[PDB]
A = this chain, B = another copy of it.
Amino acid sequence: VFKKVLLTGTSEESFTAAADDAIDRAEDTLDNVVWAEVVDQGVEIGAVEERTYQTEVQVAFELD
């Protein structure tokens, strides 16, 4: 059985690095993370100083 958690990673560099930010968080706290699917991307502009790229991913991990 896989389960997925819906995480939004952030980066001031790129949408790929914001996806990695989410995946890195998942691998800090979960075992057997196996793949991630991008579900949305956006950029925070007027709530930060430097633009911050955001990549939301469903990160799947195998249960047991």
Q: Give the residues in chain B near A2, CB-CB below 8 Å.
A: 7-8
Q: When the two chains form the complex, which single residue of B3, B27, B47 contacts A6, counting CB atoms closer than 8 Å?
A: B3
Instruction: Sort chain A's interface into a size bin.
Output: 35 or more
Nearest residue in B to A25 (C-beta to C-beta)? B1
Per DSSP, chain A at the interface is: strand
A37: min CB distance to chain B, Å: 5
Q: When the two chains form the complex, which single residue of B15, B25, B36, B37 contacts A16, counting CB atoms closer than 8 Å?
A: B15
Chain A, range 2-23, C-beta contacts under 8 Å to B:
2-10, 13-16, 19-23
| Contacts A1-B21, A1-B25, A16-B53 given; does A35 touch B47 at CB 8 Å | yes
